[PDB]
């Protein structure tokens, strides 16, 4: 549930690399972070 700045920069770089539709690919990078949590934290 917590959001470190390292995790936020990883999420921003994964969005800028992988686009917006890919979310399980981003959640593979972000440890203990589901794709719904990644999408909610981004948008």
């Amino acid at each position: 549930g917590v959001w470190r700045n390292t995790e936020d920069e990883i999420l921003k770089a994964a969005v800028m690399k992988y686009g917006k539709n890919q979310w399980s690919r981003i959640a593979s990078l972000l440890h203990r972070k589901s794709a719904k949590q990644c999408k909610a934290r981004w948008y």
Binding site: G19, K20, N21
Partner: peptide, 27 residues
């Protein structure tokens, strides 16, 4: 006939009858 390159994503007005009904509801 200039074609821009396709960029893939995979790779508002509200009616005031709402406001009229809401004001009538408050009254």
């Amino acid at each position: 006939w200039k074609i821009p390159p396709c960029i893939s994503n995979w790779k508002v007005h509200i009616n005031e009858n709402f406001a009229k009904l809401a004001e009538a509801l408050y009254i």
